[PDB]
Swiss-Prot record, chains A, B:
Cofactors that this protein relies on: Cu cation; L-topaquinone
Residues annotated as the enzyme's active site: D290, Y374
InterPro entries: AGAO-like_N2 (IPR054157), Cu_Am_Ox_Cu-bd (IPR049947), Cu_Am_ox_TPQ-bd (IPR049948), Cu_amine_oxidase (IPR000269), Cu_amine_oxidase_C (IPR015798), Cu_amine_oxidase_C_sf (IPR036460), Cu_amine_oxidase_N-reg (IPR016182)
Matches recorded under PROSITE patterns: COPPER_AMINE_OXID_1, COPPER_AMINE_OXID_2
Induction: By phenethylamine.
SUPFAM superfamilies referenced in this protein's UniProt entry, alphabetically: Amine oxidase catalytic domain, Amine oxidase N-terminal region
Lineage: Bacteria, Bacillati, Actinomycetota, Actinomycetes, Micrococcales
Name of the protein: Phenylethylamine oxidase
Organism: Arthrobacter globiformis
Role description: Catalyzes the oxidative deamination of phenylethylamine to phenylacetaldehyde with the concomitant production of hydrogen peroxide and ammonia.
Amino acid sequence: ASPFRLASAGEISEVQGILRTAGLLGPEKRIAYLGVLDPARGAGSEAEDRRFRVFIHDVSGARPQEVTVSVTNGTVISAVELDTAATGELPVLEEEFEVVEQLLATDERWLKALAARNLDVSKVRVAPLSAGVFEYAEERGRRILRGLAFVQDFPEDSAWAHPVDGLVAYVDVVSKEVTRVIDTGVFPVPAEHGNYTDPELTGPLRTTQKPISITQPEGPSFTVTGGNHIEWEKWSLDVGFDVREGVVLHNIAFRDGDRLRPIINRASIAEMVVPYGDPSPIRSWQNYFDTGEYLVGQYANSLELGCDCLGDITYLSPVISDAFGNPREIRNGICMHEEDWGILAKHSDLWSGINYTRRNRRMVISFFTTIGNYDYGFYWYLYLDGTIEFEAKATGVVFTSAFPEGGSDNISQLAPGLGAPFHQAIFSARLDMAIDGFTNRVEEEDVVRQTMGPGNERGNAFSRKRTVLTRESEAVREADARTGRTWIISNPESKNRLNEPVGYKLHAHNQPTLLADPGSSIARRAAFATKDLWVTRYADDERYPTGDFVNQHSGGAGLPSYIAQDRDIDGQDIVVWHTFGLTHFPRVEDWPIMPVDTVGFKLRPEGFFDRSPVLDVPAN
Amino acid sequence: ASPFRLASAGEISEVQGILRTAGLLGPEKRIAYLGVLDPARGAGSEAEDRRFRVFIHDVSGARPQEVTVSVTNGTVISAVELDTAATGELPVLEEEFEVVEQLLATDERWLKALAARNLDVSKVRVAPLSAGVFEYAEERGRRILRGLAFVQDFPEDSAWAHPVDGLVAYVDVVSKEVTRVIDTGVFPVPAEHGNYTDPELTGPLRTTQKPISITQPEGPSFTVTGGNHIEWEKWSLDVGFDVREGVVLHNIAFRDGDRLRPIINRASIAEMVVPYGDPSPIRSWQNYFDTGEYLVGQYANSLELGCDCLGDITYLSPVISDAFGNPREIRNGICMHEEDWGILAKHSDLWSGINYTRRNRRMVISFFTTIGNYDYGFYWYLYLDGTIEFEAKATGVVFTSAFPEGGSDNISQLAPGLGAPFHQAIFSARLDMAIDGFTNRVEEEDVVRQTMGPGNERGNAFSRKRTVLTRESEAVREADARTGRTWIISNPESKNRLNEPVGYKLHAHNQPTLLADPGSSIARRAAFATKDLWVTRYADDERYPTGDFVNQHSGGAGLPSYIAQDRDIDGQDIVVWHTFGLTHFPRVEDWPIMPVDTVGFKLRPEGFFDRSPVLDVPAN
Ligand SMILES: [Cu+2]
Ligand SMILES: [Cu+2]
Ligand SMILES: [Cu+2]
Ligand SMILES: [Cu+2]
């Protein structure tokens, strides 16, 4: 049917059969990534050619491969071998994570570090994190994971409250060798528990909260057809899901009268980096590329009703592949519902005596994921008025350390002896623009202040200026909250009735971008996070700002290499990449579990419609 | 009962009698403003003295006065003659507004202008706007109103669709005299209607939206006692109402276990200016001071249940005084309710097997006001986790003009021949701080990037810096979204368990501030709007950023004057003044009636509590 429908279990099992038949999926092979490909731009597919891209890992040490399969025709369109030391390691496998603690438990260097701190190895949990690329030459080409320890005094104990600072071990997860055990010195291990479920910490629970029942007596106003095709209040789109990106939006279009007008071809969070700012050797290597290295969609929570999604929810249970190509379903991993959103438009006119009030509503599409100690919610919203917004919700338990006696300029104290190193959480939304079609262009709009004088004798005049970004070498922009900088995406060939190109305007939160030194490993690997806006000429292969392979990959791929092509983006098929994120200096209130914090962006019509598109909304 | 209770009709009446009996309320005297006074510093004198301040206008040109009455004593505490040419004019009376259109109808110059344009005078509506202070030397001491014409082809017609450009009249509403009629040129009067209630425009309405029912089967969780004292989820405060500011909140405090901890002593929007950036003499004088000149509380709407406020609402019907001292009730003028706010805290822990999830909630207190073409909503939100937030929603009909042939750099076209000049809507929240008491201080907190080298050899470290604002001469601060600049209010003598002074952090949106040339009239009259944050030493007479009489006030009134005293703000009773607004370049979809747009700010505890304050929230 629709070439944008969600991958079915049947298709995932067929991809496995095809790889197998092709001799690409023997016993030593592991699927490190599997996802359906989008229909080629023009006519690269005849009827419907469903293709899947796969990254195949080899547990014996053999070179991995990147394969594209046509589940329709039962063919392997391509299968190339990867030189991982050059182009990057494959995302970490779930199974490689549990390896680290196990190996460490019989390591004499490890055991001695633990003994020096009087810790029972059986109680020391190990957080296996991505390694990144640093000065360890023997790591080039190997799949390394670094482990940090936390004491878990008992079964239901949150070990995050008991970091074991001064110790870290590097583990090669393929050869199963502990490559290094670094012990800088003993630090008292914070003794206070942070068991937020323990009545002796919570105290008696609140009995003051009364119920709020949200209901929809006739069901929702949106319709789901073809499994993931949503139609709501003029809006039309397809909700997709990829194990790497999570919820992905396709064909966002608005039905303006007789015509269905496209707005965004595809929207997704293409990358998410969480860089740490503690300069201690125990943690200066820590950087979570949640999308690129871990694959956030894989860790998507099974949302419970009444708990995570309140109201009249319509759930999608996406299917992903496990390490062997078998399909596993993420039950209720995606929530869809509409929510009241206050007042849309209001005016009490004296002259006419007419009082007009209209309520707003928004369509929500979300999922929550867990990456170790942290949990994140991804929300996409569609409003009656044509506005599109995204919201990231950060929660979970903060990553801890010991708090250095004598304080720290890169670590905050949360409890006695317990520290929390500073970090950021930066996202990259990839917006494949289709404003009334693919012939688009982007303009940077700045407020313009005028001087008092001729033509502006009263000095009250203020204007705005718009600069067309004509080629990629000019499309890497930074925010300017001071001059109200925004970016407008227009279709220079489609005009409204006032003879102006239709458009949409991007409103960014203007938060600080990547703070790390420009010549740091992280600045190079997360070069996208150093600027707020990048615009590129659309290309089939330009999918992630960090490139296809982020794990233990240095710079060389991603946005910086795409941009170098210096292509024409003026009235062309373009893609907008927007960087936005939080900068976190943990506060005592974030412990022992962190209250939800948020970040995001939104786009609003800008001369797209010929007048307000909500003049037909009923009073009800 | 509580000295923060809402003014009763009986007290308004009692102020009227008291005034009359003293000879202060004659037949030519009008109450241009009346409001209850807050209990000053010194609670020991538990004898409740309910005082009311009043601004008395004299319709026959005689000097106005500022009268302070004591309703409990039954006496007039003070009465002062105001030199309006020095201290500025009193707020404009609703009656003076009407006068303008009537006076002009018989003015020959007016009639000739309408004649040249073939406009039927009985159809020409006039928008009586403030005059501000410009090159007109004969206006000093005179209370003027400037009129802009709009054609209303019929009663139900929206005259905003028909601006008569190139024409403006100045009227002395005291002497009932049209001092000027300027006709710069004939501009076509925009011909199409913008009647959003007309099916010929709206077209067939939507029958797609289904009902979302929001109920509280057992009632809300907040208790309103003493008429306006709210207690909800450990929070307690008193909801006040002033005809000038609208909703004001007092004694915002949080019950931390045993101890009821004060946070904000008083919160309000002490002002809101709407400057226009059209350089045409017809509008270059245009600047609304919704709060200072028109009094937003006066125009507060009666919020209907199920249209303006959805769910389990508890209304407050504030009472104000008309121009004669009679009490007037604004029925359902304030909405109070708690609404679900999604996820509060979440974490699925691998090691402990415990999956934890909590819902958030926000207490909402709001009101909506109308000022001519524009409508605005004020929302104060209190969150379970200790967060305080404010949000202003702008809607209504945009102020129009003729769209000049050849285009314009200061006006946008919304319809054929119809223009919408650029303007801003800038607010000022006044926060009388009481973080664990009155001994507070403010620090500007900036993110600090670090250079790679010794101590940061990996170039990953990043820190933060805090500069205490010690004197008022150092408390006029600007935004720096780039460096993630925020401001923290702490109590230097109330330390948390980690022995750090408790505090709250203000997060601004970093929107542009006043764009007007620094030397313009508006820059001087609304200097508050040129910077983002001001910190002053409390003083009971320092209530507004623009002063007590904004109407036709010369310049440098409020904040700039208070700040010049250069008081010690390092560990004192202090007030924070936060400037924030929207810069509006009207878009076609804002016509013919504009969808809501928002702006605001919030404060988050910063080491106020000893750990998360929401650990006692039940799973429900
Ligand atoms: Cu413990
Ligand atoms: Cu964080
Ligand atoms: Cu009309
Ligand atoms: Cu506006």
